[PDB]
Amino acid sequence: VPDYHEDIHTYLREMEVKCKPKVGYMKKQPDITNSMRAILVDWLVEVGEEYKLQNETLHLAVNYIDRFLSSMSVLRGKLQLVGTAAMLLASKFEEIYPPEVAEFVYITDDTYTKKQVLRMEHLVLKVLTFDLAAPTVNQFLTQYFLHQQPANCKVESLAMFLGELSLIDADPYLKYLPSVIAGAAFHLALYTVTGQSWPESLIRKTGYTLESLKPCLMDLHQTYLKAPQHAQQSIREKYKNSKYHGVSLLNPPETLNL
Amino acid sequence: SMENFQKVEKIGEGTYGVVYKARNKLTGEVVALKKIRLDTEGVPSTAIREISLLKELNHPNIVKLLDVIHTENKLYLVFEFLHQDLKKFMDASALTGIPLPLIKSYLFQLLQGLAFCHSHRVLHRDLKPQNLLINTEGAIKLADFGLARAFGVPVRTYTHEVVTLWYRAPEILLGCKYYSTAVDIWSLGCIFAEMVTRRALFPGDSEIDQLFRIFRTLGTPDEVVWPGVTSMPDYKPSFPKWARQDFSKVVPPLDEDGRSLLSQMLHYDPNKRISAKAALAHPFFQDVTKPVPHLRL
Numbered sequence: 001v002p003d004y005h006e007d008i009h010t011y012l013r014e015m016e017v018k019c020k021p022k023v024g025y026m027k028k029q030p031d032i033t034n035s036m037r038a039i040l041v042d043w044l045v046e047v048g049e050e051y052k053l054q055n056e057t058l059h060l061a062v063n064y065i066d067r068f069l070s071s072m073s074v075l076r077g078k079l080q081l082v083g084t085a086a087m088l089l090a091s092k093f094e095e096i097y098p099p100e101v102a103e104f105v106y107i108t109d110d111t112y113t114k115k116q117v118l119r120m121e122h123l124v125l126k127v128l129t130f131d132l133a134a135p136t137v138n139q140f141l142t143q144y145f146l147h148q149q150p151a152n153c154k155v156e157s158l159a160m161f162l163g164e165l166s167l168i169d170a171d172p173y174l175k176y177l178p179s180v181i182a183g184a185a186f187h188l189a190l191y192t193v194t195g196q197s198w199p200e201s202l203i204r205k206t207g208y209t210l211e212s213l214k215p216c217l218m219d220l221h222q223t224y225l226k227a228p229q230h231a232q233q234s235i236r237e238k239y240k241n242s243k244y245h246g247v248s249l250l251n252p253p254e255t256l257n258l
Numbered sequence: 259s260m261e262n263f264q265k266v267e268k269i270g271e272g273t274y275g276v277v278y279k280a281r282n283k284l285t286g287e288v289v290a291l292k293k294i295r296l297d298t299e300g301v302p303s304t305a306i307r308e309i310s311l312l313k314e315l316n317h318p319n320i321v322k323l324l325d326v327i328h329t330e331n332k333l334y335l336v337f338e339f340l341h342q343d344l345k346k347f348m349d350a351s352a353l354t355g356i357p358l359p360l361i362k363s364y365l366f367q368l369l370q371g372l373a374f375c376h377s378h379r380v381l382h383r384d385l386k387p388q389n390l391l392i393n394t395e396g397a398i399k400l401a402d403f404g405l406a407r408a409f410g411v412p413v414r415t416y417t418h419e420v421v422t423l424w425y426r427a428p429e430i431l432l433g434c435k436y437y438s439t440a441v442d443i444w445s446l447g448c449i450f451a452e453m454v455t456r457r458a459l460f461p462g463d464s465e466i467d468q469l470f471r472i473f474r475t476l477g478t479p480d481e482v483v484w485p486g487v488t489s490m491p492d493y494k495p496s497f498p499k500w501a502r503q504d505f506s507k508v509v510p511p512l513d514e515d516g517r518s519l520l521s522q523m524l525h526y527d528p529n530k531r532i533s534a535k536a537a538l539a540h541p542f543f544q545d546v547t548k549p550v551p552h553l554r555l
């Protein structure tokens with residue numbers, strides 16, 4: 001819809017600041033850690049794969065979790081309950097056919113009741129004040145993909161893969177905005193596959209250069225290189241599939257040359 | 259929490275829940291209360307979509323969400339109150355008709371509200387006279403975002419069922435993988451014609467009936483008028499090939515500028531179909547004012 005592409009981009013850039021979680025919230029959580037969050041997000045990747053959910057839905061749920069935990073202290077035994085209600089809310093927002101409540105109870109391995117999941121749904125809504133239409137890494141990526149000459153499916157899937165990996169690790173990715181991470185991921189994918197760089201037209205569109213993307217791009221390069229050794233492996237397994245052109249099997253570059 | 263509100267009467271039922279006229283006891287403000295019972299499956303996706311999207315969309319031609327009251331048992335949405343809906347207004351205007359300055363004004367305002375929706379990545383997907391609300395001061399507003407959704411750029415495949423049959427775009431009927439902002443324009447085009455004639459432009463009772471009615475008015479589309487049409491999932495080579503009728507006969511009272519705008523709103527190809535934003539600058543609107551409705555509401 002070329003009549004609104006600029007208006008939408010501008011609006012998403014405004015909303016992503018307003019929807020940004022608190023950067024240092026984990027320091028303030030007495031019972032949970034970055035490592036425990038990493039386990040939850042990886043589990044949500046599996047649930048998404050199990051029920052054939054959109055990648056958008058997964059990105060939305062993670063945003064809801066991070067915003068919830070920005071103000072609400074949660075014990076380790078209740079973290080999975082927050083995650084389940086968040087994923088249920090994201091499914092209701094984003095999916096044509098969301099899985100029913102019973103199905104979300106089943107995948108918790110009977111840890112929680114139907115009543116508990118429903119009560120948590122209601123609480124997450126109160127805490128987020130029903131503000132669920134948040135911009136994601138995904139929403140920026142698909143706009144950035146339109147600037148390919150020409151369109152490359154390996155580039156697209158590898159950018160989606162890298163953006164997904166950023167969801168796992170609160171340190172350091174909580175400090176970067178969705179549009180910046182999408183920038184880092186798009187350049188890194190485009191460089192790995194074709195040798196090309198962050199294009200001139202996206203500089204005009206976004207205001208971002210390689211210079212401004214450098215810090216996020218430096219972290220994301222390191223996450224990419226160290227991906228086979230990471231404790232959490234569901235994203236790598238997911239992106240082995242031909243649906244995503246087996247992009248996780250590609251070799252990361254050794255240097256970026258910035 | 260509901261203590262300061264006094265219900266007056268039931269207004270009706272939309273996509274989900276029930277709408278009541280009410281009065282704020284303290285401020286005096288007349289409101290509309292949308293009651294949802296959670297007697298199940300949690301909060302419905304329709305309520306989740308309407309609330310989140312409307313909290314973003316502050317505009318004079320979009321019905322204002324004032325508050326959300328969230329009890330253990332019930333969920334109440336507090337809306338601004340409007341006096342009448344466009345359908346009931348068109349029925350009451352049967353004898354006198356609707357004055358052309360009022361039709362022009364209403365269309366201009368509706369295109370403003372729609373342009374705002376689309377600029378904020380929101381598709382309404384249920385535009386029809388019932389969902390268009392009017393006050394005594396001459397305002398018209400988009401209402402019921404229960405079937406609305408937040409879209410991405412470019413679009414994915416979304417729900418197929420969408421839009422009440424009479425106002426449903428041909429790309430939905432022919433089962434295109436992707437639809438976008440153009441579906442809302444199609445619906446408004448239908449409503450534009452309906453404001454002039456005071457009867458629905460394409461009143462079909464099935465999907466195939468709806469298409470054939472559209473074809474008899476605009477001509478059966480080919481690859482020349484709409485590239486890719488013959489390859490669409492629900493296109494049939496056996497479709498009768500009707501000629502496009504003179505556009506001055508579709509809506510006879512309409513002037514040259516009116517007819518020009520309507521044709522662009524009812525263009526077969528979604529890409530060629532005029533945007534709400536671009537339609538605001540159409541010569542039809544050169545002499546637009548904002549008159550009050552000619553009838554007590």
Ligand SMILES: NC(=O)c1ccc(-c2ccc(-c3cc(NCc4cccnc4)n4ncc(Br)c4n3)cc2)cc1
Pocket residue numbers: 269270271272273277279290292321337338339340341342343388389391401
């Ligand atoms: N055929 C259908 O599916 C159908 C039928 C009726 C309706 C319907 C639902 C609600 C309303 C309505 C009507 C009014 N106002 C018109 C009105 C006022 C007083 C008495 N009667 C109508 N408001 N005002 C705020 C709000 Br939120 C609101 N909502 C109008 C029509 C929708 C779909």
Ligand SMILES: [Mg+2]
Pocket residue numbers: 026027028029030031032033
């Ligand atoms: Mg801690």
